[PDB]
Design a binder for this molecule. Sequence first.
Ligand SMILES: O[C@@H]1CN(c2ncnc3[nH]ccc23)C[C@H]1F
Length: 167
Amino acid sequence: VNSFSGYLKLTDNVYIKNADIVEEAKKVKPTVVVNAANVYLKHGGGVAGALNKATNNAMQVESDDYIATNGPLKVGGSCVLSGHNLAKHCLHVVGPNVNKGEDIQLLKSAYENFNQHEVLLAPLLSAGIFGADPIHSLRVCVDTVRTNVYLAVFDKNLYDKLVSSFL
Ligand SMILES: O[C@@H]1CN(c2ncnc3[nH]ccc23)C[C@H]1F
């Protein structure tokens, strides 16, 4: 039993809710919140820009030190950093950005990072400003993640379409 509330159950291990991941994180304080990161951990917009703003830019400060030490992530890769005031940990995961020409096949690799964590709050990777089809992102998620994932979809209209079209 965990403290996630109001989610529709899609499969044995995948749940979905129309919610602002920032507000969800602030309420639940999950062990892991997933960020829709880029390789440079530049949290300018989308989910990443919103999560960083909620940390008062502390996420960006930590991220800049990480990059200065380690260099950029791989597309499809991840790193674990602090969750600041939102969660114990933030798993920064880089899904392909279609608006940069990045291979959508790397989306499965991106979701594989979730399997290193027993429970996660997460957005749909590569959705929104990353330019992938969120219906496709959901299918890959369900077919790849085996740990317990609670998906927050900010857009209510998108939430309804994902549920109604889910196979
Ligand atoms: O529409 C897609 C999904 N997405 C979000 N998903 C969940 N919570 C959120 N909070 C702020 C943004 C946001 C950003 C965009 F890439």
